[PDB]
Amino acid sequence: TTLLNPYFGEFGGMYVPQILMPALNQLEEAFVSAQKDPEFQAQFADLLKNYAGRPTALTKCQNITAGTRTTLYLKREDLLHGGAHKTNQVLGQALLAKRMGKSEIIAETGAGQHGVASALASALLGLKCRIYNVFRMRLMGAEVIALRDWSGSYETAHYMLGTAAGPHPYPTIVREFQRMIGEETKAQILDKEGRLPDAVIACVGGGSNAIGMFADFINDTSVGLIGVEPGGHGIETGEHGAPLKHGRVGIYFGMKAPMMQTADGQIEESYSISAGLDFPSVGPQHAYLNSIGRADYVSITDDEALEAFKTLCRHEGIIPALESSHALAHALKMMREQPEKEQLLVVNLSGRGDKDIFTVHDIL
Amino acid sequence: TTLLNPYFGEFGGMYVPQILMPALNQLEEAFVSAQKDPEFQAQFADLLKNYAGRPTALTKCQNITAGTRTTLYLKREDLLHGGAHKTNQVLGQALLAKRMGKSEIIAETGAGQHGVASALASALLGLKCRIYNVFRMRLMGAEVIALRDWSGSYETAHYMLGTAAGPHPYPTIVREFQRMIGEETKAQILDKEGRLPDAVIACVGGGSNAIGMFADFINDTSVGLIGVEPGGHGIETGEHGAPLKHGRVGIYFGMKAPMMQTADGQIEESYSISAGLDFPSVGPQHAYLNSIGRADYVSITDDEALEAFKTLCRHEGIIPALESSHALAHALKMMREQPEKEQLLVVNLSGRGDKDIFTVHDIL
Amino acid sequence: MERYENLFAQLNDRREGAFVPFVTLGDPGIEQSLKIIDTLIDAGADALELGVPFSDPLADGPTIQNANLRAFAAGVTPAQCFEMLALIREKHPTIPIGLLMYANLVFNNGIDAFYARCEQVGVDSVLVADVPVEESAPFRQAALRHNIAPIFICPPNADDDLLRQVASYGRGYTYLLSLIEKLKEYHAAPALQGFGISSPEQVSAAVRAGAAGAISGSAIVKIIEKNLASPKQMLAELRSFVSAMKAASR
Amino acid sequence: MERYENLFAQLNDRREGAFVPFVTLGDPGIEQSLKIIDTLIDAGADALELGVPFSDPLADGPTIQNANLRAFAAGVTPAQCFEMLALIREKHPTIPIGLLMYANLVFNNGIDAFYARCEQVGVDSVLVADVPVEESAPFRQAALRHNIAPIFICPPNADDDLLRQVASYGRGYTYLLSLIEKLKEYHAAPALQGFGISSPEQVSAAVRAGAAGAISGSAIVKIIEKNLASPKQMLAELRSFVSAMKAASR
Numbered sequence A, B: 001t002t003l004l005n006p007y008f009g010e011f012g013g014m015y016v017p018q019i020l021m022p023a024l025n026q027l028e029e030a031f032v033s034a035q036k037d038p039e040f041q042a043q044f045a046d047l048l049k050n051y052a053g054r055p056t057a058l059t060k061c062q063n064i065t066a067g068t069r070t071t072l073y074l075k076r077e078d079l080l081h082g083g084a085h086k087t088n089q090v091l092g093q094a095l096l097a098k099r100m101g102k103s104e105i106i107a108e109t110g111a112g113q114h115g116v117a118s119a120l121a122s123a124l125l126g127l128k129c130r131i132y133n134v135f136r137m138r139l140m141g142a143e144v145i146a147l148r149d150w151s152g153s154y155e156t157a158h159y160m161l162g163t164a165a166g167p168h169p170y171p172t173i174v175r176e177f178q179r180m181i182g183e184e185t186k187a188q189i190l191d192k193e194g195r196l197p198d199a200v201i202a203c204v205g206g207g208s209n210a211i212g213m214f215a216d217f218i219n220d221t222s223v224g225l226i227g228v229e230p231g232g233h234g235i236e237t238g239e240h241g242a243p244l245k246h247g248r249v250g251i252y253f254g255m256k257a258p259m260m261q262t263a264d265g266q267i268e269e270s271y272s273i274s275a276g277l278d279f280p281s282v283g284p285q286h287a288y289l290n291s292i293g294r295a296d297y298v299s300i301t302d303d304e305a306l307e308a309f310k311t312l313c314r315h316e317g318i319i320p321a322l323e324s325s326h327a328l329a330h331a332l333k334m335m336r337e338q339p340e341k342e343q344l345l346v347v348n349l350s351g352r353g354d355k356d357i358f359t360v361h362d363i364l
Numbered sequence C, D: 001m002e003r004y005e006n007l008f009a010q011l012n013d014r015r016e017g018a019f020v021p022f023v024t025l026g027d028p029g030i031e032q033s034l035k036i037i038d039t040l041i042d043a044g045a046d047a048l049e050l051g052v053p054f055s056d057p058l059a060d061g062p063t064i065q066n067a068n069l070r071a072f073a074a075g076v077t078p079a080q081c082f083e084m085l086a087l088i089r090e091k092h093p094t095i096p097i098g099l100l101m102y103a104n105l106v107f108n109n110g111i112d113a114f115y116a117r118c119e120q121v122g123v124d125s126v127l128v129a130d131v132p133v134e135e136s137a138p139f140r141q142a143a144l145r146h147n148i149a150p151i152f153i154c155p156p157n158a159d160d161d162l163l164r165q166v167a168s169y170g171r172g173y174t175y176l177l178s179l180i181e182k183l184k185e186y187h188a189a190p191a192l193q194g195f196g197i198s199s200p201e202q203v204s205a206a207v208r209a210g211a212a213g214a215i216s217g218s219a220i221v222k223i224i225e226k227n228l229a230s231p232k233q234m235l236a237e238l239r240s241f242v243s244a245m246k247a248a249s250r
């Protein structure tokens, strides 16, 4: 029994030990309340605006598209506080934790992007953060040492999931706290072009920045939604991170969704030049949008992403994150493969690539 | 003979070889024209807004000031494209170069901040950039190899000075292309507090971010202008970068201004934990504002700046540049030394400190 | 074959509690594991709880996780586990055998197909660790169709509505996580207290509290974890522990 | 003492051009520098242009900059330069001596005080490299008060208004940077062509163009830069170069 539908078609659910259900149910209830509370919205909007830096700009790239009938716009989440879209949803989740009377945050990160984001939010809102960029986290008071800990401390601590995945209501909450990306993009594009985009493109690691851009356009049937999974060294090599289109449905991390697993049912690892897209699964809403044909998903290899990375630097003076470079790479392909095709595109530049300055250097 | 006054009291002028005067005169003339040209303003405003990310936010820090009668606001230039205020003036100078029919940019940098900024601007506006972060510059097409080169190529190349110093009209141009910092701060503070700040504080390396914040408040006599020079290991140790208050007037870099030089007249070097404040001199307008008592200047040591750096990270979740940390450090002192003094302050957070993540790490 | 129903019946006539040890199949190895299980049974184990190595065990404690690593390191696979299970059932026809599974391993090649395989090797029950009662429908329906008892965990922070569900959906036994009257009030399957059970006094306290028995895992696994270099001493210590724990249930 | 006025007078009566070599004081060292200068004069130099090592020489070419480094490395200071200047004047009473200075070194301990010192040691002219005619007022006023000729550079990209200023403000000689009729039309001080002058034919071409002479620096310094390990050969090569260049002005 829940207030919101835990599923997106056949994907989603709450596949976690019984002991964690009260925490999930409590979270959904608080979220439903916060969403209807004007006071919560005003507080959230205030932080996003005066702290995070929203709205983010929508930049048109005229140099990159020169000679073609493609018009490209980049949603500048790389200009958001922290350098990535992640900040948006961590602020919201941070406020929800306080709304629930909690004073501690529990989180984990691989590269450190989400870890840093949770730490910065926790320092601002006066929350005790424990995490499982290491210096950046410690510099902000975050304690660098998950669900196990939350099992016996969820009464005073909130688990800050970093993507639009995991058990309900996380997929739904992360989307709502990231949807301003799409809402702004729509208002901005209508102001600059007087029409909706032909398609919006975003990389898909966990699915949060992509769903944040997609959300507000889902009801605009004419608008194409394109999710880009990492192809790594190449789909056929097996070393990639594209479970939605090249994985198999399974149950893991509290959800039923496409996953990269062995024939036996053992979850495998996802490879990509960009660590930020290493999630071996994908958000349930994306699996669903794909199943009904509302959203289309493709993959971009490391070489294509790297090329997109170099191209934006020299032609626009913007250094994108290798993750966001996968999205840009597909847009460039759409343009290059059919240069006389008139199309208005928007690529969600989920983050800045200053952190990838060394990674790309060695590869060169 | 010039269109604008080359001096600020006794400071300023154009002390460059005769062969470079035509270039300076041409620049001043083009600037005067561009300033009166609505088309130029609209183009400049468009880049700042849809490319740079202006306006930047004005964040109130409630955790840092808890327990005192101080209200602190931080002008978020760290949220500007590139991570520093530098971008503002390089975009403007880049547009001026094109207005003059030039297609090449000449620049030089120490740490690389200004070098990167010029490169990004050049890539965007289609300009051939030559510079004297090295990877970031090359990644954006900038050629990493000054006035000498400009001497015999100023007909096709513009010299992009990085601070509010050097020969006229650079001090004046850099200020005008950075004054939106102060203009925004004024509108924002009036909206949030309904009054002007008691004082605005900014670090002074060359004087550009500081003059950008000061400019619009100069006529508001009630508003205090505080410039913070680097004290390094301590003024009395001699190893510092505070020429305005602890230097001697001389002629160097095409201008007459306070400078750090030997008793013999040989320009010396300025030390500071932050390389960005290594300029051995200071902008002429600052020397002048100090002489008449309109602006006050103080110094902050490396230890105080470091402490301000750590304090903002843990209490606000913002990682400031070590340069900007000198400004924050003085504000904290103003607060700490007189906790019951009611005052509304604004610190210009000139940049983000992600680049100082290693520097501060080793020191620890 | 109602092995659980039969066991509890016999245990109640002897006014004794049940002692169910837990171990990971293939830890530290297929050969040594089978010997461990035979020692556990000979020592007096009334029933068995066996885990199948999974790549991402959410509700798995630290001691248990190390067991999975040792199993995987040995090259243990789900297919090999079922081979062991058939061998165990062939040597012991009445002892109840319950599996501790993770959702993906059951859903992998089809939910119905997994329970069909359990019934084929002789498994009596299956507890899917990451499947709450709210998502159990397909699992318990398939389990019942193949005469497999779907086991559910009753947490300490469980309300009345959960007690009713666990009582209605559960079969074989109720995994009581460290309330017994309410369960019996709703005619729930015999309760077995688990988590923290490592001493003889805890087993008596459990039986005295109203439970039909107790389950012990970490303690059992720990003995294996500290005698890897001495297989013989391992079985010896396991026999002593089990013998003492079972004696406390009488 | 009007050494420049006297020199040009004598040179014109002999229908010859002037050859003025440039070197950095103290390069490669005080002792060796003084010897270099005496060799330059004995070789036939009509006048001298001497530079004072400065930390940041803007309008200083590469070859000249290295000379400053060698001077500084030797421990040369402005104070030591004036000591050399007094020594040079004491050995050569009529040869015009001009200094190539940078603004800060002149403004440092007072503009008026600097020119007073020049007049005391016997300096005839001073060219402040980073002081354009638009900012020259205090420098040339102080120079004239101390009988020092303020020298100005006339660039190739100079318009008519600059020609008039240079003609009106200049004294001693006009530094013509590589137009002579216009200068003479405005009664400017005798022109000396500088920059690039390294061959005998250039000196003749200059005199034939209408200039009173030519200045050579880089070429002179280069000879020093390539004979540091052979002081004797250095003076020898300097004498040959100077002798040839001066012969071309006759």
Ligand SMILES: O=P(O)(O)OC[C@@H](O)[C@@H](O)c1c[nH]c2ccccc12
Pocket: A017, C022, C049, C051, C059, C060, C061, C064, C100, C129, C153, C194, C195, C196, C197, C215, C216, C217, C218, C219
């Ligand atoms: O280790 P303990 O405290 O003695 O409890 C047995 C427990 O580990 C075992 O039943 C178990 C293994 N995996 C699980 C997953 C969920 C619930 C319980 C389990």
Ligand SMILES: O=P(O)(O)OC[C@@H](O)[C@@H](O)c1c[nH]c2ccccc12
Pocket: B017, D022, D049, D051, D059, D060, D061, D064, D100, D129, D153, D194, D195, D196, D197, D215, D216, D217, D218, D219
């Ligand atoms: O080196 P050249 O090309 O031969 O020119 C002499 C020149 O270097 C000398 O007069 C000089 C030294 N420093 C200067 C500064 C400005 C103008 C001229 C100079």
Ligand SMILES: *Cc1c(COP(=O)(O)O)cnc(C)c1O
Pocket: A084, A085, A086, A113, A114, A162, A163, A164, A203, A204, A205, A206, A207, A208, A209, A210, A276, A277, A321, A323, A324, A350, A351, A352
């Ligand atoms: C972490 C990250 C991502 C991956 O997350 P999603 O949940 O797929 O958005 C994408 N872009 C950037 C810049 C990231 O830091």
Ligand SMILES: *Cc1c(COP(=O)(O)O)cnc(C)c1O
Pocket: B084, B085, B086, B113, B114, B162, B163, B164, B203, B204, B205, B206, B207, B208, B209, B210, B276, B277, B321, B323, B324, B350, B351, B352
């Ligand atoms: C370069 C830099 C400065 C120094 O320049 P000013 O001209 O004194 O503003 C200050 N802050 C930051 C972040 C810088 O990068």
Ligand code: NA
Pocket: A204, A205, A206, A241, A242, A243, A270, A277, A278, A279, A280, A281, A282
């Ligand atoms: Na993924």
Ligand code: NA
Pocket: B204, B205, B206, B241, B242, B243, B270, B277, B278, B279, B280, B281, B282
């Ligand atoms: Na300075």
